[PDB]
Amino acid sequence: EFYHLVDDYGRGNGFFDKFNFFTGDDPTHGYVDYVSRDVAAGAGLIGERDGRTYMGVDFTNPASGRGRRSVRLESKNTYEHGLIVIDLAHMPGSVCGTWPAFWTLGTGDWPYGGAIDIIEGVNDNTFNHMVLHTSDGCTIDNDGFTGNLKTSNCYVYAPGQDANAGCGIEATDPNSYGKGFNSIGGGIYATEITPNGISIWFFPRGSEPGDVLGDNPNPANWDTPAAKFAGGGCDWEGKFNAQRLIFDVTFCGDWAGNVWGIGGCASRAANCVDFVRDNPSAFAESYWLVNSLRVYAP
DSSP, X not given: OOOEEEEEOOSHHHHHTTEXXXXXXXXXXXXXXXXXXXXXXXXXXXXXXXXXXXXXXXXXXXXXXXXEEEOEEEESSOBSSEEEEEEEEEOOOSOTTEEEEEEEEESSSTTTTOEEEEEEOOTTOOSOEEEEEBSSSBBOOSOSOXXXXXXXXXXXXXXXXXXXXXXXXXXXXXXXSHHHHHHTTOEEEEEEEETTEEEEEEEETTOSOTTTTSSSOOGGGSOOOSEEEESTTBOTTTSOOSEEEEEEEEESIIIIIHHGGGSTTGGGOSSHHHHHHHOGGGGTTOOEEEEXXXXXXX
């Protein structure tokens, strides 16, 4: 009557089979070494934990080569419109030097297909950042959400663009990300993509609507979203094409590495790379633990 399931991603190997593992150099120039599925499994970076799907980074070995070992999974299936609901028992922590992201990326050359960052942050961030990335000609309005809008222009390369490289809204619940989020047993992030805009809701563990995990979720009746990206300043239908789901954790790089020295992690090491290379144990909390990932369509 409102939305129907188009994909339940399951768990474990069945879940992994639905993604391609990216092993190229990090597009955001981080100190990371994205490894293949076989290598990741051999290093304990992916697996199943009591029925939940685990995706993490190397928190054992001093790093070498391209950087600290991690994985970047990109879905084989793509969606032009729909509702993506992820129930997470855990997400990468608020760890200095890290830059985790659960997001979507359109087809074609970046940023022409658009991109939607659902869960994202850097270093010791407390609040989740929800950010879109588009080509020029896409700005957002100020209403319909509970978060704090930080940037209004989604064009990645706009004139005085923020380090978030897009139009971002910051959550106001400190349990929306990292440490706080893990401390409460996680929660659910629901993202709706329509021809008129994108909305993202965050439900801390136990507060989610009774229909968000079922077979007919209906966002029209949910409380105000944490972020809403809409308005006449953007062609929402044309700026985003078929999106693939992505899980990753990179380190340092364009955002985390560039703001390292001016933030709360500055005293940990002269620069981000030194820290990530020499302190493997610092990254134990940098993992995703999925209860369920389901995509729906109207």
